[PDB]
């Protein structure tokens, strides 16, 4: 039997129950036992210590790089059928220094869910689309409505949107040698950007202590004018808070002057300890073929990495006839995500130790937002702490 490990998937039990069921009908010799987890490295280490490593593991570019730098992922090129990469988007297939360590699965382009009713209360007609327009926008929301314009968490190991904003703001995080590269005019400007927003009462005070689940809660309460989220969460807004969804419009995500948006890549990898690597590759290919990826794109309102499924999903969206405004809203969001994908890139560099770097930056930025140190003081402390870590790991 094979053990499949997926990341943060309750709402998608029926999808998994059918596709894995189909797999079990096709491959009775390698039945799948599925476990979904949130905190992934601790559980992989325990299974590998017991010499019971899973066969297919769901990863993202940052975590996949930490594992592959240590020789833990199978080079799939040896086992992949010839012309298997032809079935995937080339930009996302090549998004995996240790060879081909992962097969692309699905991906998400997050949009700006804008509360249009809060905008009219603030005397605004639309939400900003670039970060240098965020302060003026946030002030108008804060003073005329009392609500908050946006919510970006600085809890060290929560969402990476803050670190992604650094990249969108032109900040260079690491050089070749893995040394700190953000003590630059861009990095100091980015640190001051977030410090000044918090100190001026423009951000919710709990951004230093709560993650995107609080942002979700604030938007559904009508207390957040812009929520960085995808199409799938829009349907739960429709059910949980119809008053807010009725005045919600999907909008392009916030970017920097370069325009690039972020895309969250989900992949499937085969640990080197796996004793059924060939069957594991077959399972990863089955989960990511045209039919299964298209079906998951519909049920999850997500974008696939399969060319066949991506074109099929784009085609269904262009000719979909929604029966009510709710379905039309969901169609508008999914279509905007599919259109944004042509300009979106992966922004957190798929390098080892990026979560250590995120934690150091978020911690120092947090000290500056609370007024315990200056912004430049946070930059220096972050730079020196990262170089402490980087000299020990990569001398």
Residue numbers in the entry: 10 to 18, 20 to 48, 51 to 108, 112 to 410
Which sentences from the paper describe this structure?
We report the functional characterisation of a modified sugar-binding protein, MsBP, from a marine Synechococcus strain, MITS9220. The presence of the additional C-terminal subdomain places it unambiguously within sub-cluster D-I, associated with a narrow substrate preference for carbohydrates.
Our crystal structures of apo MsBP (no zinc or substrate-bound) and Zn-MsBP (with zinc-bound) show that the presence of zinc induces structural differences, leading to a partially-closed substrate-binding cavity. The structure of MsBP displayed two chains in the a.s.u. Overall, the structures of MsBP and Zn-MsBP overlay with r.m.s.d. As previously discussed, the general nature of the binding cleft of MsBP is positively charged, which is markedly different from structural relatives that display negatively charged binding cavity, appropriate for interaction with simple sugars.
